[PDB]
C-alpha cells in the first residue's frame, strides 16, 4: 500500500489510478478535497458515472453490488464512494466489504472515506484484500502549531501575500476549521486582487464582516432562537470548527448583557444602548428583555466552566446546555 498526504495525492494519482482509495481522517475539508482530486483526475479518463453510499445498518448492499456488475450504455467507467459509519467498519460491514473488494473489476474505481481505521480493523478481511492494490490518503486536521503553516502554505498555493501576523489571527478565530480558513482566503482574495492580505484586512475580514459564523449562533441565543440555533451549532461542527472558540465570543456578548442587565433603570434602552458600541437593538433588546439576571449568571457560570473543563478536564453536549439554557 501507498501511504500518502493530501499534498502528495495529485502526484501519485497522475502516475496512474490505483484500484481503490482510502481517505482516512477526521478533517472534513481534506477528505472532500482528496476525494475530488481523485474523481477529477479520474473523470478525465472515462469515469463519467459516480455513486455514493453511506455504510450504516441500512445500506442496501444489493444495489451497491448490482452496480459493480453493471455495464455502461455509453461505455463510461464508474466511481463508487463509500461513507463508513462514524465508529468504523462494523463486524457485519467487514463482510459486505469483503464481498465487494472482490467485485472490484476495472471500469470501477473505489473510494472509502472515514476515520483512522479502528486500530486492529486494518486486519479485517476486505482491508488486507486491497492493502497492496490501493492508495491511502491520511486526512487529519492539523492543529495548533501545525495549523499556521497549513494556512501559510494554502495561501501561497493561491499566490497570496499573507502576513506573518495576519496568518496567526486567521488561525485564532477559525482555529480547527479548515473549510472556514479556506473560504476565508478565497474571499479576501476577491476583495483584494491586489493580493496582499495584511493584518488590517484579515481583522477587517473577521471583524467588520459578519461572516464569523459563531456570531450567527450567539445571535440565535439572544433572539432565543433555540431550534434554528441548534442547527447552526450542528453545522458549526460539520465543518470541523473547534468549540474553544464559540465560548470566547459568547462569553463576551453574554458578559455585556450582564453589564447591560445590571442597568435596566440605571440608564435605559437607548440611553446606555447608545454607549457600548452594539446598537441589534431588537436582539440585545430581546435578550435583557425576555431573559433575566438569575438566568444570565447561570449561563455565565456554565460557559465559564465548560471552557475550564476542556483545559482542566482535557481528553473528553455542554453547549446545547447553554443553547437551550439561554432560552426556556
Amino acid at each position: 500500500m501507498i501511504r500518502l498526504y493530501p499534498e502528495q495525492l495529485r502526484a501519485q494519482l497522475n502516475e496512474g489510478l490505483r484500484a481503490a482509495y482510502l481517505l482516512l481522517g477526521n478533517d472534513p475539508l481534506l477528505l472532500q478535497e482528496s476525494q475530488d482530486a481523485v474523481r477529477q483526475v479520474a473523470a478525465a479518463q472515462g469515469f463519467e458515472e459516480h455513486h455514493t453510499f453511506s455504510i450504516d445498518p441500512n445500506t442496501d448492499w444489493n444495489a451497491i453490488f448490482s452496480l459493480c456488475q453493471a455495464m455502461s450504455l455509453f461505455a463510461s467507467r464508474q466511481t463508487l464512494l463509500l461513507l463508513l459509519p462514524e465508529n468504523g467498519p462494523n463486524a457485519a460491514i467487514n463482510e459486505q466489504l469483503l464481498t465487494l473488494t472482490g467485485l472490484l473489476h476495472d471500469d470501477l474505481l473505489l473510494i472509502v472515506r472515514g476515520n483512522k481505521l479502528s486500530k486492529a480493523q486494518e486486519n479485517a478481511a476486505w482491508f488486507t484484500a486491497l492493502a497492496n492494490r490501493s492508495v491511502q490518503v491520511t486526512c487529519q486536521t492539523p492543529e495548533q502549531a501545525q495549523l499556521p503553516r497549513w494556512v501559510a502554505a494554502r495561501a501561497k498555493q493561491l499566490n497570496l501575500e499573507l502576513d506573518d501576523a495576519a496568518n496567526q489571527v486567521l488561525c485564532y478565530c477559525y482555529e480547527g476549521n479548515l473549510l472556514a480558513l479556506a473560504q476565508a482566503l478565497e474571499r479576501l482574495s476577491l476583495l483584494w486582487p491586489d493580493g496582499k492580505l495584511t493584518l488590517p484586512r484579515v481583522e477587517q475580514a473577521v471583524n467588520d464582516a459578519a461572516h464569523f459564523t459563531p456570531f450567527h449562533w450567539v445571535d440565535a441565543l439572544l433572539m432565543g432562537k433555540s431550534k434554528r440555533a441548534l442547527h447552526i451549532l450542528q453545522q458549526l461542527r460539520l465543518e470541523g470548527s473547534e468549540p474553544v472558540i464559540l465560548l470566547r465570543t459568547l462569553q463576551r456578548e453574554l458578559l455585556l448583557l450582564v453589564n447591560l442587565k445590571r442597568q435596566s433603570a440605571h440608564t435605559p434602552l437607548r440611553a446606555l444602548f447608545d454607549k457600548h458600541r452594539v446598537w441589534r437593538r431588537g436582539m440585545m433588546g430581546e435578550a435583557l428583555n425576555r431573559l433575566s439576571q438569575t438566568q444570565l449568571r447561570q449561563a455565565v457560570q456554565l460557559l465559564t466552566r465548560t471552557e475550564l473543563t476542556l483545559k482542566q478536564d482535557y481528553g473528553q453536549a455542554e453547549l446545547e446546555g447553554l443553547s437551550l439554557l439561554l432560552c426556556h
Partner: protein, 366 residues
C-alpha cells in the same frame, strides 16, 4: 381585492396549481399562491422556480381588482375542509386574506404579490397540439428509464424532440435506454429539449383524457402546456443529451422472438429463485431455445426453458432482472422481439407487432 365563487370552481383549480408544490418551502413566498382579479377573471399561480402552474377562473359572482400572496397549504385545506356547495368570499384586508364560507370565516397572513417570482415571461419558439393520451403514452413509454440523481444532470430528465410530424421522447440512465415516437398531425421544425424529472412528472399529472387536446409551446429555455384552464410551465435542463441513435445496436446478428408474458415469468421466476439478487438473471439462447436461469455464479440450480424463434450462435448473457422487466411491462404487448450480438454489448428489446417504441439494455457482468 375581492371575489366570491363556489367551493367547486375553486378546489379543483386550487388543487392543480398547488398540486406539485407542497412541503417546507424555503422562503415563505415560495410556498404561497398568487391571487389576482381583473377583467372578470381570478388567476391562481403557484411556482417552485423550476416550473409554475396557473389556473384561470372567470368570476361569475361579484369580483374586484387586486393582487395578493396568501399561503398555499393553508388556503387549500380551508376551502377543501368546508361544506361542499358552500360559497367562498375572499377580500384583501390591508395585510390579511379575509375568507367567508357562510360564517365560517378565516383570516390568512399574506405577503405582497409584488414579491412573487413569476417566471418573468420569455419567447415561444415552436407550438403544436396533440391529443392528451398521445402526449401521455410518449411519457409512460420512456419515463421509467430516466436516471435519478445522476451527476450527469442531463440524464435526470427526459428529452423531447420533434422532427417531421413525429414527436419522440427518450430517457436514459446510461445502462438502459428508452425511446418512443408518435404522430402529432402537424409538420414541425426540428428542435430537441430536455424536460426535467419534476417537470415531466407534472406534465404527466395534468394529462387525464380531457376534451382539451394539450397545446404545447417549446422555446428558448422554457416549455409550457395549456390544457384547457391549467397552464403548466417548466424551465429546461441544459447540456448535451446522448444521441439515442448512437446506442441502438449496430447490425446485430442474433435475433429472437418470444412471448411478452412468458418471458416475464421466466425472468420473474428466476428472479425469486435468486436468493442473492445482486447476481442477476442469466439468459442462454440456443437455436430456437431459451434456457433462462437465475445466475448463481457459484452454483447450478433450477431454470426454465422457452420455445422461441432464435437465430445466430449460442450465447449466455447476463441481465439485471429489473431492467429487462420494466421493458416487458412498458411493452404491453404479446410477442417481444429482441436483437443481440455479444455477451458484453447492448441489446435491443422491442415489441414485434410495432416499432413505435424501442428499448436498449446493457447486459451485466456474468
Amino acid at each position: 381585492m375581492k371575489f366570491t365563487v363556489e367551493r367547486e370552481h375553486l378546489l379543483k383549480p386550487l388543487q392543480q396549481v398547488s398540486g406539485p408544490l407542497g412541503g417546507r418551502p424555503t422562503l415563505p413566498i415560495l410556498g404561497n399562491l398568487l391571487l389576482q382579479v381583473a377583467d372578470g377573471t381570478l388567476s391562481l399561480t403557484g411556482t417552485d422556480l423550476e416550473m409554475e402552474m396557473v389556473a384561470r377562473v372567470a368570476l361569475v359572482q361579484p369580483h374586484e381588482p387586486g393582487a395578493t400572496t396568501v399561503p398555499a397549504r393553508k388556503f387549500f385545506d380551508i376551502c377543501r375542509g368546508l361544506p361542499e356547495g358552500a360559497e367562498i368570499a375572499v377580500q384583501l384586508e390591508g395585510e390579511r386574506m379575509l375568507v367567508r364560507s357562510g360564517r365560517s370565516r378565516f383570516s390568512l397572513s399574506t405577503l405582497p404579490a409584488a414579491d412573487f417570482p413569476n417566471l418573468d415571461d420569455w419567447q415561444s419558439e415552436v407550438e403544436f397540439t396533440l391529443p392528451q393520451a398521445t402526449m401521455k403514452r410518449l411519457i409512460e413509454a420512456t419515463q421509467f428509464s430516466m436516471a435519478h440523481q445522476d451527476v450527469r444532470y442531463y440524464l435526470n430528465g427526459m428529452l423531447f424532440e420533434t422532427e417531421g410530424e413525429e414527436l419522440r421522447t427518450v430517457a436514459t440512465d446510461g445502462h438502459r435506454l428508452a425511446v418512443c415516437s408518435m404522430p402529432i398531425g402537424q409538420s414541425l421544425p426540428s428542435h430537441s429539449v430536455i424536460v426535467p424529472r419534476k417537470g415531466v412528472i407534472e406534465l404527466m399529472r395534468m394529462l387525464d383524457g380531457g376534451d382539451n387536446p394539450l397545446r404545447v409551446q417549446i422555446g428558448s429555455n422554457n416549455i409550457r402546456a395549456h390544457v384547457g384552464d391549467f397552464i403548466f410551465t417548466s424551465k429546461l435542463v441544459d447540456g448535451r443529451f446522448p444521441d439515442y441513435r448512437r446506442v441502438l445496436p449496430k447490425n446485430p446478428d442474433k435475433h429472437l422472438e418470444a412471448g411478452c408474458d412468458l418471458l416475464k415469468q421466466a425472468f420473474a421466476r428466476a428472479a425469486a429463485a435468486s436468493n442473492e439478487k445482486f447476481r442477476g438473471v442469466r439468459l442462454y439462447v440456443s437455436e430456437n431455445q431459451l434456457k433462462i436461469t437465475a445466475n448463481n455464479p457459484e452454483q447450478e440450480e433450477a431454470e426454465e426453458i422457452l420455445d422461441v424463434t432464435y437465430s445466430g450462435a449460442e450465447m449466455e448473457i447476463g441481465f439485471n432482472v429489473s431492467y429487462v422487466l420494466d421493458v416487458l411491462n412498458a411493452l404491453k404487448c404479446e410477442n417481444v422481439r429482441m436483437m443481440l450480438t455479444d455477451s458484453v454489448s447492448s441489446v435491443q428489446i422491442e415489441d414485434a407487432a410495432s416499432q413505435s417504441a424501442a428499448y436498449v439494455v446493457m447486459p451485466m457482468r456474468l
